[PDB]
Write a protein that binds this ligand. Structure first.
Ligand SMILES: [Zn+2]
Ligand SMILES: [Zn+2]
Lengths: 55, 180
């Protein structure tokens, strides 16, 4: 319904001052940081290795 | 033959696979669990050198890093970080997405990734209502059960940060919906 084309419009102008979350500067992001020596090791291999067990 | 109330309500059971009761993982869910993702600084070699303000800033940074990342898989309705002492819950991160497809896309991507030098574990979770799942003591007063507690000890970020993240996601979602 083209109704939604303008419920989008009301949303977008009520948020004109707002930074979208994909452009949010993160204070401290730690995603995809690997320990040294694991350049050739996948996440699954590391999990299967037993070195990173869940409590 | 009786459903494990704790697995289905909280997404975690103190008995693990040794439980006498039924744990069946869903093949579809709006909610995921990344077990033990959150490592509270307090319990680390450095942790007691930090002031309360430093600790609060560190947690806001963690919560932000989580919410912003999970948003890339789809609309995030709620994010809960467990600060329990017990092994079954300590550091558990739960995310409820609007759509089941988001949750599946998330665990498939997350299971191939690392976070702060540890590989990420992610699974679909049976949890449907964080209100039921969260420890009402830990909210209202303090829970003094420690590892005995079977409910989530939700650690909350600065309210302004959460409001800002929700707004930022609303903007992101609106800009995406405006692509057609
Ligand atoms: Zn159980
Ligand atoms: Zn409790």
């Amino acid at each position: 319904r083209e109704r939604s084309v303008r419920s989008i419009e009301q949303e977008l102008e009520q948020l004109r001052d707002v930074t979208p979350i994909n452009q949010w500067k993160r204070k401290r992001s730690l995603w995809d940081i690997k320990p040294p020596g694991y350049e050739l090791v996948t996440a699954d291999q590391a999990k299967m290795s037993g070195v990173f067990p869940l409590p | 033959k009786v459903n494990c109330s704790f697995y289905y309500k909280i997404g975690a059971c103190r008995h693990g696979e040794r439980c006498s009761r039924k744990h069946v993982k869903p093949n579809f869910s709006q909610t995921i669990l990344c077990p033990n993702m959150y490592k509270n600084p307090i319990h680390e070699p450095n942790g007691k050198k930090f002031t309360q303000r430093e600790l609060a800033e560190q947690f806001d940074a963690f919560y932000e890093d989580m919410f912003c990342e999970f948003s890339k898989y789809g609309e995030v309705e709620q994010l809960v970080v467990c600060d329990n002492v017990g092994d079954h819950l300590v550091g558990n991160v739960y995310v409820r997405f609007k759509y089941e497809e988001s949750a599946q896309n998330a665990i498939d991507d997350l299971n191939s990734r690392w976070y702060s030098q540890r590989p990420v574990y992610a699974e679909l979770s049976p949890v449907t209502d964080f209100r039921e799942a969260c420890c009402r003591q830990h909210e209202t007063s303090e829970c003094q059960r420690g590892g005995l507690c079977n409910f989530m000890h939700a650690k909350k970020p600065s309210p302004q940060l959460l409001r800002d993240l929700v707004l930022a996601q609303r903007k992101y979602l609106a800009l995406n919906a405006a692509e057609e």
